[PDB]
Amino acid sequence: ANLRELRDRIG
Amino acid sequence: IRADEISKIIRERIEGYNREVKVVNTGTVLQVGDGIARIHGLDEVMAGELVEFEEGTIGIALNLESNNVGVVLMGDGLMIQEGSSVKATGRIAQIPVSEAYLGRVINALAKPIDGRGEITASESRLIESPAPGIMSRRSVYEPLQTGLIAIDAMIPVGRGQRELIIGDRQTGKTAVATDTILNQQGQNVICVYVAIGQKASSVAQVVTNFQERGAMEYTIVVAETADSPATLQYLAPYTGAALAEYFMYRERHTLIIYDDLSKQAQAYRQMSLLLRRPPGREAYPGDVFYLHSRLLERAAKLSSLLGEGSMTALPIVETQAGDVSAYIPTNVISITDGQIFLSADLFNAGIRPAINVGISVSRVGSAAQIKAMKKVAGKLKLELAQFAELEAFAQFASDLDKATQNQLARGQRLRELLKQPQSAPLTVEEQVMTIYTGTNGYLDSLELDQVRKYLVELRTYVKTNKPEFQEIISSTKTFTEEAEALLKEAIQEQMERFLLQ
Amino acid sequence: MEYTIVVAETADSPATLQYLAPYTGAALAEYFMYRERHTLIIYDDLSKQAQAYRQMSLLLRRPPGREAYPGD
Amino acid sequence: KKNLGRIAQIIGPVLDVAFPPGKMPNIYNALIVKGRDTAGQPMNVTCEVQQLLGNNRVRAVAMSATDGLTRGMEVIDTGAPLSVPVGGATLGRIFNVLGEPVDNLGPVDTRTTSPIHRSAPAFTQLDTKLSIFETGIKVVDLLAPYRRGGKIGLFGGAGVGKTVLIMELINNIAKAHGGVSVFGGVGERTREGNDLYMEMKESGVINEQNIAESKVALVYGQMNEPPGARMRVGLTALTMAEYFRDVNEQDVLLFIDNIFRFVQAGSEVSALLGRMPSAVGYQPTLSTEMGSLQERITSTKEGSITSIQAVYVPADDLTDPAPATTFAHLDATTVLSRGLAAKGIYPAVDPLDSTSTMLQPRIVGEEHYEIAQRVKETLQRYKELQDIIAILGLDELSEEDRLTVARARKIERFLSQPFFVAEVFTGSPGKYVGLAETIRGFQLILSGELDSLPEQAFYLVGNIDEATAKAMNLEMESKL
Amino acid sequence: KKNLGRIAQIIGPVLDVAFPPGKMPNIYNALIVKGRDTAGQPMNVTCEVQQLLGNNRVRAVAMSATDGLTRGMEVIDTGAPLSVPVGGATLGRIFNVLGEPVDNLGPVDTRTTSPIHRSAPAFTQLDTKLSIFETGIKVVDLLAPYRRGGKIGLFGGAGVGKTVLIMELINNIAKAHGGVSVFGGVGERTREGNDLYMEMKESGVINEQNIAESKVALVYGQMNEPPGARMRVGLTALTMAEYFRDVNEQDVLLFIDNIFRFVQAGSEVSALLGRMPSAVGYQPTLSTEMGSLQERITSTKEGSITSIQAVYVPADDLTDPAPATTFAHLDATTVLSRGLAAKGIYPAVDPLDSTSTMLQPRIVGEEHYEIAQRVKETLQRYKELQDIIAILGLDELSEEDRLTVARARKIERFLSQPFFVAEVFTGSPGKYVGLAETIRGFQLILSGELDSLPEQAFYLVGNIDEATAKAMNLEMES
Amino acid sequence: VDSTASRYASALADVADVTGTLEATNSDVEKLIRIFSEEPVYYFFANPVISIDNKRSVLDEIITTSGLQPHTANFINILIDSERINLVKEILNEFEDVFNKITGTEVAVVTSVVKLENDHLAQIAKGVQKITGAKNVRIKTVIDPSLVAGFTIRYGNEGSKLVDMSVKKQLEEIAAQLE
Ligand SMILES: Nc1ncnc2c1ncn2[C@@H]1O[C@H](COP(=O)(O)OP(=O)(O)OP(=O)(O)O)[C@@H](O)[C@H]1O
Ligand SMILES: Nc1ncnc2c1ncn2[C@@H]1O[C@H](COP(=O)(O)OP(=O)(O)OP(=O)(O)O)[C@@H](O)[C@H]1O
Ligand SMILES: Nc1ncnc2c1ncn2[C@@H]1O[C@H](COP(=O)(O)OP(=O)(O)O)[C@@H](O)[C@H]1O
């Protein structure tokens, strides 16, 4: 869930 | 490339090889690693049987491999010598248990370590024992006075629950567990605190605060320092559970605190790696989940047929940098009845104790509260989640409605009444009167800092004025209408007394 | 369905037949394509086929690679 | 059968057993150890052989504990897989993986029995019936309709409301069913299984005064068990349900919780059976095993099985290989979120990620499909708007956009219903909402005629009428 | 005679030694091996037994360089663990890993030795007194007080201020603290082990003439030795302080720098001993390795050990297994940020990630704990607002929010303090500030009697009057 | 050399040293090597798809036809039931090795064009007895028309130590030519 939440913060 | 062929065993077996004999009664030592010994011989030994070395250090025959036995050590193997003989103890890892252990600091070896004397216990119990099944259990239906108003209103822990106290570094977890133990001084529960792999100064500090607060007649402190091997640390919570499990079989309500469980988990990771078992995610074994399950499922409430002696776990797990996605936090969350997550960011922000009420779970719910608190704390945690989520959004706004802003104020008053100081227990009478003064909007007319400074004086006021409130709430456990009328008069006259101020 | 062939090998099959099935679809489409006739083929999905082949490799002690998928 | 196999190695839960070179058991046979316990009496520790190793030694898996098993014990082949009792005797009895009655009642009628390991039905014996059935939970009714006879997953994390939802779903469906139900507990809290047993003893579906008139059979392989029990309780329960649908030919139900503990048990025992580790630590035999288990759960031309199973998701990551595998073998999937969980909206079903195969124009009616896709539309609009209105502010949107924000903020609260089993957790009497009421509520909320109601009026209300009466309650209290 | 055997293998610093069959060396017995040099006979290579491999063979990590070690040389087992000299001889001397002088002076007493693998004092022998130990730095004095007798951990990345901080703590403390202070240099530069020595010698702490009255012992496992030596210098310094604390009853100080190298030593040798790798790179026996040092560094009723130590967190990661297992055996952590270092507020102590077990109102009183609590509250309020500030700025806030942002912007600068050591870097000479005046400075900040004067006034000062006179001074130079 | 095989060979040498039957077991394993030099009988015993009772029977017929003491045969019994049968050729090469090592019959090889007599063999025998501590020094000779002037003597645990007095001078010269 770390990479998904990091991608979503990027977005 | 393969062990058990060390050219002295080969001649020992080649001198007689017209035979089918067995050498069950003895066994030799082939390797002595960093706490794990490979044994040749022992052609009858169980998996888990206690095996004693030539020095006199006992061990457990964990891995029963083909021709040789990989035995772990319940001590430091500095004086083991290879080629020397081992034995079989015949019993499978029992510790003595009786009601003379109460108040004494014990090793994981179940031998006392405060030097206060040797302890006597006739009946013994295995350190590993199966959990009670479905017939010898019942629903959790008694309360448990933790003393903290936040947990006792919003995350109701009851007698027979296992509430994981999960958190981060230095965020108040052991403080929560110690207040839970120290509060019980008139309820007759047998507290057990198994300190696994903690700093010895912290063990002595906790036992000194215990013996100064008077809980030396309750507890047993099953504490070993960091200098135990991996095996003693891995075994310690099973010893603590054996003691408390003995007690709850004797229809006494107990309370056990595992502190921590990631320390037992890393201890088990050591032995899974030094016995060359395969590692999994983050080099943990696959079966550390089953380890925590077999340890943690032993705590529940016994049925009406087995004396109804409950047993409550309160395992403690720290999370590095505040996550859950790691292995051992996720496992212990999935096993326990709910979890209490303590956030260090609400901790540094004055909110102490720092219970993040959003993601803290109580799986037993208001069937673990008395009828009084069950009435007044009916829809409390959910409405507080709503107030927190709409206060987070009302910062994205400029102008609001007065109705919702008054709602934000009342939610702030509910938020302010739940900060409980350390070593300051609230009783259930104090708790329910505080929460009735809170949830009905009797606080919405004063300033923020005045909330607790008003509430403590009101509580002392009803202490010294209305014992009929105490008797109604205590004897009958139900929030009747006469008590509510008493409380409303108390709030009104207290408001006039502060209006004089 | 007057022209569509649908080869299929569901999840309950071994990894062997899941690995095989797209090649049988490809051989049928190859044959019909070599009869001077235009064709089409749908693979659904290559992820399940790759998981089947990865399991077939890791069971045969072929060395694992990136995210356990073998080097093939 | 009738050989004498000796234990040759015990690495915890796995055993290595050797046989005389004449007879050797088949894969998935059932060994049984004539060992001894601590008191010296003969105790059986049942086992399943998972692997032929060569040099006339095979590798077993213990269905019970190993503490007390000695290198030099004797085992007896049964020449069969683990047969489990079936019929009308398996009704109202708690059952282990070993087919033994765990509840303190007498034995079971073992003249009719069935082996655990069989193969899934043929392609021609699958019944293409796509009928819808009204659940009652407003989200589960409207947004994600459940297929009758088709598998259904409750994907969720830890402590979001899977078990509450599946217990309330039993409370709703089983009493209004037309057949038998079976419950298989695979790795759950023992006290929660006993909570279910007591709540169903008082809910009459056991009717324990007269056995075999019960309508539920309970199997439990929970968390305090060695990996064999958890790895095979799903197969035991599925064999019971398969008997109930194949010989009786009646609609059966099968609530499987928790299936992630089944896969985890497989991986736990699989790392030690010699297999290389797959992705992040599950077994290499993941997908074909979930096929060998799931594809037996199917509707058929004799009697359908609707299988509401609760799938755990580790770390709330649907990427994880066990949810990634489990998604394929399910029809009507439901995603339980943590955001809506701590937000207060229970049930925490994520409206945008929960998606079914039954929500169709030609399967679930025109007005339902239009209203459902429209609700998902306006919520996707709000969740897209969120990271803008965070930093921008609320006075810098247009009337259509702020109207969308407020209407979505009503909708999200209205999809929260106080369950029957959650009265302990909410503080409200239980609710049951019809499909008609839910589509009426969303027509009324969306079309505009309720934007004068409070955005806490739709919190934990059953009908839109109850939302209006709660709105009157709130406003009257505030005006005093 | 002691039993002697031959080495069968050598894999770098890991030496596999076979013996005659009946007579085997114990665990942790040292193996003085004769070896061969180019000139003469070296013999300085020395091995301690870690494992027993069977077939009358042990495996033993070499403490010194492993070249010279030809396969098939005679290895004599001493019969005891590795035993270093201690008592009055080590004082004022720089020692090696095996307890041998490396400062090129006269031979020390080879008589009053003690083995390094002695066990920890029993749980009965613990003392339970909690007293604050003021050092004069604002961030340790207000926020996370250090404890007399408690182990104190300093964390941080590479070059974020750990060694200047431990040298400043030594500068303030070790002059007046009338007990021996055993500095231990494990895994750091020999330049530091030399500059410390030259400062000690020129100051007068180590007087060459009359080296007896020195009351400071040193030992150095630097960055030029095999992993065995950097793995055992910690235990060398530990027994060299343990003798003082046990027998002379002295309050002893201990300064280790930096124990992450002592962890990495075991993580480097366990991959050579063949043991299976644990979490991402380290050995499986990691926390036991930690405890086998840390639990022996406790205070008793006989004496005291206060152990300042630097714990280098690797790759600026705080949740790596070695700092993660270091965090448990400490009485106070003071983690050193990279952001506060790059932004110039030196020392770069992370304020609200610094924690001590002694910030309790029963120890430091009500007023001090109250002021500390409110300081941490305002700092976290600014920390929460930092994202909204960094993306957009400050005008979007309420006035009551910019009051906290301004107060914490003044605090974040007043948390600096110029060092008596680091004056040679910045140029601002060292200032010692008391606790009783740090509290009053922070009370004057939080009251609002100082919020009018600017924010760079508070930067790099000592007392509060230095900040007010700084504000009065920078309005003269127009 | 603590291999999987030299432990077995060292065990058999240990048994023959405590029993006093080493110099007999040397020719015993000479017979057993001329047994296991043939691929069909070594292939019969090596491959794992032949049942165990017939292996017992046929090795017993080899014993009753060649007359061996269980001092020798129990080794093969332990090997076959320990599935170390495919390492029998390695063990039987290391048996004479450890037997020469302990009983001191050290082997010395020479490789040259040599047409030698007892003299050069004897003097190199006593010289390597003095410098290597050979209890009994035994020679090995290889005829090689390549190395022209002198010889190439090897000895040690495996023949590791070398001094060649033929072409080493040649390589020193062609190396110091350009240097
Ligand atoms: N409600 C409270 N009010 C004020 N202070 C509190 C409260 N609860 C805890 N604390 C403070 O937090 C301090 C540290 O708590 P504690 O040691 O329990 O955290 P911990 O997680 O056990 O630490 P560690 O990470 O070392 O295990 C206690 O000394 C106590 O003073
Ligand atoms: N108070 C300070 N003022 C100015 N510069 C400082 C200060 N503290 C640290 N520094 C800078 O940090 C650099 C390194 O600090 P220091 O050597 O003390 O710690 P370190 O390198 O982390 O220690 P080690 O690497 O030995 O563990 C110094 O060059 C110095 O320039
Ligand atoms: N519909 C609901 N209404 C109220 N509370 C709920 C609801 N669903 C879940 N909860 C909360 O979740 C907890 C139970 O979650 P559960 O389903 O047992 O966890 P898991 O999904 O991990 O099995 C209860 O404590 C309850 O407070």
Task: Point out which residues pair with D94 in neighbouring strands.
Answer: D218
Q: CA nearest D197: which of B134, E390, B293?
A: B134
Distance CA(B39)–CA(B28), nearest Å, equals 6
| Domain interval for residue D401 | 359-480
Domain of residue F148 covers: 105-179
Q: String of b and e for E56-72 (b: at least 16 CB within 10 Å)? A: bbbbbbbbbbbebbeee
Q: Locate the DSSP E strands across chain F.
A: 105-112, 136-143, 152-155, 161-164
DSSP string, B371-399: HHHHHHTSSHHHHHHHHHHHHHHGGG-S-
F51 with F127, same domain: the answer is no
CA distances from E166 to E26, E163, E200 (A): 38, 5, 14
For residue E53, give the chain B residue with the closest CA: B31
Contact with chain F for residue B10, Cβ under 8 A: yes
Question: Distance between CA B373 and CA B434 in Å, rounded?
Answer: 11
E171 in the same domain as E44:
no
Using the 3D structure, point to which of D26, D50, D81 is the last residue of a domain.
D81
D339 and D315 inside one domain = yes
Is the same domain home to E5 and E150? no
Q: Is the peptide bond between C12 and the residue preceding it cis, with omega within 30 degrees of 0?
A: no
Q: CA–CA separation, F110 vs F97, rounded Å? A: 18
Within 8 A of B3 by CB-CB distance, chain E residues are 54
Helix or strand or coil: residue B72?
Answer: strand
- B10 vs F4: CB contact, 8 Å cut-off? no
Token pair recorded at residue F17: 């040293």
Report the C-alpha gap between B376 and B428 in whole angstroms. Answer: 12
What are the DSSP E strand ranges found in D71-128? 74-77, 83-85, 94-95, 113-115
Residues in chain D: 480
Q: Report which bound ligand comes closest to the CA of B149.
A: 1
Please give the number of the atom of ligand 2 that sits closest to the Cα of E336: 22
List the structure tokens of E52: 């027993």
Residue located nearest, by CA, to atom 24 of ligand 1: B170
Q: In this structure, are D202 and D323 located in the same domain?
A: yes
Give the number of whichever ligand sits closest to the CA of residue E310. Answer: 2
**In degrees rounded to 5, what are phi and psi of residue B162?**
-130, 90
**CA distances from residue E70 to B207, E29, F18, F156 in whole angstroms, order as listed:** 55, 21, 32, 15
Q: Does D372 share its domain with D353?
A: no
CA distance B95 to B106: 12
Nearest 5°: phi and psi at B190?
-100, 100
Nearby residues of B51 by Cβ (< 8 Å), 6 or more positions away: B27, B39, B42, B45, B58, B59, B60, B61, B69, B71, B86, B87, B88, B89
CB-CB neighbours of B46 under 10 Å: 25
Tell me how close the Cα of E19 comes to any Cα of chain D, in angstroms: 32
Dihedral of the alpha carbons of F74, F78, F84, F86, in degrees to the nearest 10: 40
How close, in Å, is residue E384 to chain B by CA atoms? 9
Query: Hey, what are D195's tokens?
Result: 């909570």
Q: Cα separation of B402 and B386, whole Å?
A: 17
The answer to whether residues B29 and B80 touch, using CB atoms and an 8 Å cutoff, is: yes
Tokens of E266: 């075991």
Ligand 2 atom nearest E347 alpha carbon: 1
Residues F98 and F117 in one domain: no
Q: By CB neighbour count within 10 A (0-12 exposed, 13-18 middle, 19+ buried), where does E192 fall?
A: middle
Q: Are residues F176 and F123 in the same domain?
A: yes
F72 in the same domain as F15: yes
State yes or no: is D261 an active-site residue: no
HEC per residue, chain E = CCCEEEEEEEECCEEEEECCCCCCCCCCEEEEECCCCCCCCCCCCEEEEEEEEECCEEEEEECCCCCCCCCCCEEEEEEEECEEECCCCCCCCEECCCCCECCCCCCCCCCCEEECCCCCCCHHHECCCCCECCCCCHHHHHCCCCECCCCEEEEECCCCCHHHHHHHHHHHHCCCCCCCEEEEEECCCHHHHHHHHHHHHHHCCCCCCCCCCCCEEEEEECCCCCHHHHHHHHHHHHHHHHHHHHHCCCEEEEEEECHHHHHHHHHHHCCCCCCCCCCCCCCCCCHHHHHHHHHHHCCECCCEEEEEEEEECHHHCCCCHHHHHHHHHCCEEECECCHHHHCCCCCCECCCCCEECCCCHHHHHHHHHHHHHHHHHHHHHHHHHHHHHHHCCCCCCCHHHHHHHHHHHHHHHHCCCCCCCCHHHHCCCCCCCCHHHHHHHHHHHHHCCCCCCCCCCCCCCCCHHHHHHHHHHCCCCC
**Which tokens in the block code for residue B143?**
């309360």
Which residue's structure tokens are 């001894």? D36
Q: Is E463 on the interface with B (CB under 8 A)?
A: no
Within this chain, do residues D150 and D239 fall inside the same structural domain, yes or no?
Answer: yes
Catalytic option among E59, E93, E151, E188 = E188
Whether the CB-CB separation of E346 and E294 falls below 8 Å is answered with no
Question: How many A from CA of B171 to the centre of ligand 1?
Answer: 5
The answer on E183 and E147 residing in a single domain is: yes
DSSP 3-state of B441: coil
The tokens describing B213, both together, are: 């607060």
Is beta strand D181-185 parallel, antiparallel or unpaired with respect to D216-220?
parallel
Our mutation pick for probing the ligand 1 site, out of B151, B176, B342, B352, counting the most ligand atoms within 8 A of Cβ, is B352
Residue E346: partners with Cβ closer than 8 Å, 6 or more residues away: E161, E340, E416, E422, E426
Give the contacts of B56 (CB within 8 A, at least 6 positions apart). Answer: none
Residue F26: cis peptide before it, omega within 30 degrees of 0:
no
Which of C27, C25, C28, C17 has the alpha carbon at shortest distance from C52?
C17
Asked whether residue F75 falls in the same domain as residue F118, the answer is no
Phi, psi of E12 (to 5 degrees): 55, -130
Interface test mutation site (partner E, options B36, B201, B208, B448, max chain E beta carbons within 10 A): B201
E347 upstream amide cis, omega within 30 of 0: yes
- Other CB atoms within a 10 A radius of the CB of residue D112 amount to 13
Q: Are residues D211 and D103 in the same domain?
A: yes
The experimental technique behind this entry is: cryo-EM
Please count the structural domains in chain E: 3
CA–CA gap between residue B313 and residue B296 (Å, rounded):
7
Residues E397 and E347 in one domain: no
Both structure tokens of E467:
């900040």
Same domain, F50 and F122: no
Cα B144 to ligand 1 centre (Å): 21
CA B232 from chain centre, in angstroms, equals 18
Domain boundary among F74, F104, F134: F104
The residues pairing with E18 across neighbouring beta strands, listed in sequence order, are E6, E57
D256 and D179 share a domain? yes
Measured CA to CA, the distance from residue E299 to residue E69 in angstroms comes to: 42
Q: How far is the CA of B174 from the centre of ligand 1 (A)?
A: 7
Q: Quick one: resolution in A?
A: 3.8
d(CA D398, CA E68) in angstroms, rounded, equals 83
For residue B195, give the H/E element and its range.
Answer: strand B190-196
Which of F70, F104, F138 finishes a domain? Answer: F104
Using the 3D structure, point to which of D41, D63, D81 is the last residue of a domain.
Answer: D81
D291 contacts C12? CB cut-off 8 A: yes
Q: How many domains, chain F? A: 2
List the single residue in B228, B321, B350 with the smallest CB-CB distance to E373. B350
Q: At what angle do helices D259-270 and D287-294 cross, to 10 degrees?
A: 130
Q: Do F69 and F129 reside in the same domain of the chain?
A: no
Angle at E420 between CA E417 and CA E426, to 5 degrees: 70
What are the chain D neighbours of F48 within 8 Å (beta carbons)? 54-55
Measure the CA–CA gap between A9 and D391, rounded to whole angstroms: 13
Please report, for residues B225, E331, F115, the alpha-carbon distance to residue E148 in angstroms, rounded to integers and kept in the order given: 20, 10, 88
Boundary residue ending a domain (F104, F134, F166): F104
Q: Check: CB of residue D7 under 8 Å from CB of residue D75.
A: yes
Which of B460, B486, B488 has its CA nearest to residue B473? Answer: B486
Q: What angle do CA E402, E405, E406 make, to 5 degrees?
A: 85
Task: Tell me: do F80 and F147 sit in the same domain.
Answer: no
| Cβ neighbours of residue D341 closer than 8 Å, sequence gap 6 or more | B359, D159, D160, D161, D348
E163 is in an annotated binding site: yes
Cβ B333 under 6 angstroms from ligand 3: no
- Which domain-ending residue is among E294, E329, E358? E358
Q: CB–CB of E160/E337 below 8 Å?
A: yes
Show me where the domains of chain B are located.
Answer: 1-91, 92-369, 370-501
How far is Cα E95 from Cα E99, in angstroms, rounded to an integer?
Answer: 6
CA E335 to CA E320: how far, in whole Å? 14
* Residues constituting chain A: 11
